[PDB]
Design a protein around this ligand. Structure first.
Ligand SMILES: *[C@@H]1O[C@H](CO)[C@@H](O[C@@H]2O[C@H](CO)[C@@H](O[C@H]3O[C@H](CO)[C@@H](O[C@@H]4O[C@H](CO)[C@@H](O)[C@H](O)[C@@H]4O)[C@H](O)[C@@H]3O)[C@H](O)[C@H]2NC(C)=O)[C@H](O)[C@H]1NC(C)=O
Ligand SMILES: *[C@@H]1O[C@H](CO)[C@@H](O[C@@H]2O[C@H](CO)[C@@H](O[C@@H]3O[C@H](CO)[C@@H](O)[C@H](O)[C@@H]3O)[C@H](O)[C@H]2NC(C)=O)[C@H](O)[C@H]1NC(C)=O
Ligand SMILES: OC[C@H]1O[C@@H](OC[C@H]2O[C@H](OC[C@@]3(O)O[C@H](CO)[C@@H](O)[C@@H]3O)[C@H](O)[C@@H](O)[C@@H]2O)[C@H](O)[C@@H](O)[C@H]1O
Ligand code: NAG
Ligand code: FE
Ligand code: ZN
Ligand code: ZN
Length: 341
């Protein structure tokens, strides 16, 4: 009923979910899975109700009948008067980041280099860059393009996982959850920051949130914006201040999905949960903040201002957009009446 079971990916998200559960009086409860895909499955079975997903998984989930309910909304500049929950979503910029000291490394010389991806199947870390690379190469062997990488979710024995490090014990190497050191936006960027990889496929925001004192995490403490460069599709290199003219694409924001028969109810519970634990929430920062977790982006991205209502009750195809939807279809022809489970 007004009770919602959230699906947590990995033990760290489980921990944050439990706090949220404790503070919600149990209006929100938790289920945990090792992978986002397993979480998709728990929702289909009806053992969990919702979770926040990157666009790539929204695509997987959509083919299986799950729908967009509310989307992450971060601070903008245009469309000022509108409240956050009513304001349109902008989408983030997918970028390719390199070290400035690594001269002569451009989009046109990425072959045989070392890469850092958020996870297999994600928008900025995989779908966009690999779709572009397959497109340009005219060959479905994206697994041979880079010499070594860390792409959580690929075969641990393959070169796509050679750069991944697992947890502090060396266990769970390449798993697509935060236990993997170089998982997600922050992980992929850390992979580049520590010179494990030559390039990182992350979003524009990740660079800003983890440099010039914004992080304080020990690996990011001393990172400086000028030491990084974005790779543009025209073979050029630009400062990270130029993301508007040097991105690989703009991605649809992450969004909360659920089985359609449960959407209306998940929507009403969440809107109330954010009134309590959101940005200007009754109990944040006092008791619990839904959008905080110190640069780890647990359950939701840390830069989320609020969860917004979607305009025009969009299907997953409309929400992702035709442009992005055909990009994925074309890449998956390498790896359509579907649903993977
Ligand atoms: C690439 O991604 C970066 C990071 O997301 C984008 O830069 C961000 O732009 C925001 C708006 O477009 C900036 O937020 C506004 O609101 C706050 C409050 O008014 C301003 O100051 C903040 O103060 C708090 C202190 O409590 C700090 O937490 C913030 O760091 C900031 O100092 C801010 O000046 C601005 O008016 C936001 O600050 C900014 N983020 C950072 C880390 O600088 C960037 O636009 C984007 N590029 C493109 C092309 O999209
Ligand atoms: C990989 O290559 C494929 C195939 O060339 C790319 O797909 C193509 O994408 C374009 C742009 O999305 C599609 O064109 C669009 O057509 C509509 C209809 O007129 C129009 O409104 C848009 O303005 C645009 O012109 C095109 O149909 C599609 N081609 C095929 C065969 O699917 C794909 O984008 C490439 N991958 C990446 C990541 O770019
Ligand atoms: O979530 C962010 C992404 O949304 C994707 O689909 C959802 C979103 O986008 C549509 O598109 C373009 C446009 O209307 O959005 C803004 C302001 O929101 C503009 O810049 C545009 O005019 C749709 O019409 C929206 O209602 C919806 O919220 C989309 O594929 C991505 O581009 C990105 O916006
Ligand atoms: C839990 O749900 C009830 C039913 O709407 C609501 O009245 C109450 O405020 C909620 N409590 C918390 C802590 O969210
Ligand atoms: Fe993403
Ligand atoms: Zn563009
Ligand atoms: Zn529609």
């Amino acid at each position: 009923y007004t009770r919602v079971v959230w699906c947590a990916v990995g033990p760290e998200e489980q921990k944050k979910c439990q706090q949220w559960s404790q503070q919600s009086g149990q209006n929100v409860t938790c289920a945990t899975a090792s992978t986002t895909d397993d979480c998709i499955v728990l929702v289909l079975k009806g053992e969990a109700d919702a979770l926040n997903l990157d666009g790539g998984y929204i695509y997987t989930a959509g083919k299986c009948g799950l729908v967009p309910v509310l989307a992450e909304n971060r601070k903008s500049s245009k469309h000022s008067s509108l409240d956050c929950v009513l304001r349109p979503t902008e989408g983030y910029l997918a970028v390719a980041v390199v070290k400035k000291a690594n001269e002569g490394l451009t989009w046109n010389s990425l072959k045989d280099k070392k890469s850092c991806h958020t996870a297999v199947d994600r928008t900025a870390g995989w779908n966009i860059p690999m779709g572009l690379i397959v497109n340009q190469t005219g060959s479905c062997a994206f697994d041979e393009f880079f010499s070594q990488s860390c792409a959580p979710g690929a075969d641990p024995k393959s070169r796509l996982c050679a750069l991944c490090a697992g947890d502090d014990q060396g266990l769970d190497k390449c798993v697509p959850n935060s236990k993997e050191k170089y998982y997600g936006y922050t992980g992929a960027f850390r992979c580049l920051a520590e010179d494990v990889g030559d390039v990182a496929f992350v979003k524009n925001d990740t660079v800003w949130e983890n440099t010039n004192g914004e992080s304080t995490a020990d690996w990011a403490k001393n990172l400086k914006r000028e030491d990084f460069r974005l790779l543009c599709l025209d073979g050029t290199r630009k400062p990270v201040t130029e993301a508007q003219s040097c991105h690989l694409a703009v991605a649809p924001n992450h969004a909360v999905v659920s089985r359609s028969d449960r959407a209306a109810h998940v929507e009403q519970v969440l809107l109330h949960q954010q009134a309590l634990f959101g940005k200007n929430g009754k109990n944040c920062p006092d008791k619990f903040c839904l959008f905080k977790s110190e640069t780890k982006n647990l359950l939701f991205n840390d830069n989320t201002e609020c969860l917004a209502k979607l305009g025009g009750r969009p299907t997953y195809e409309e929400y992702l957009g035709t442009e992005y939807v055909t990009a994925i279809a074309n890449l998956k022809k390498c790896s359509l009446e579907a649903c993977a489970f």
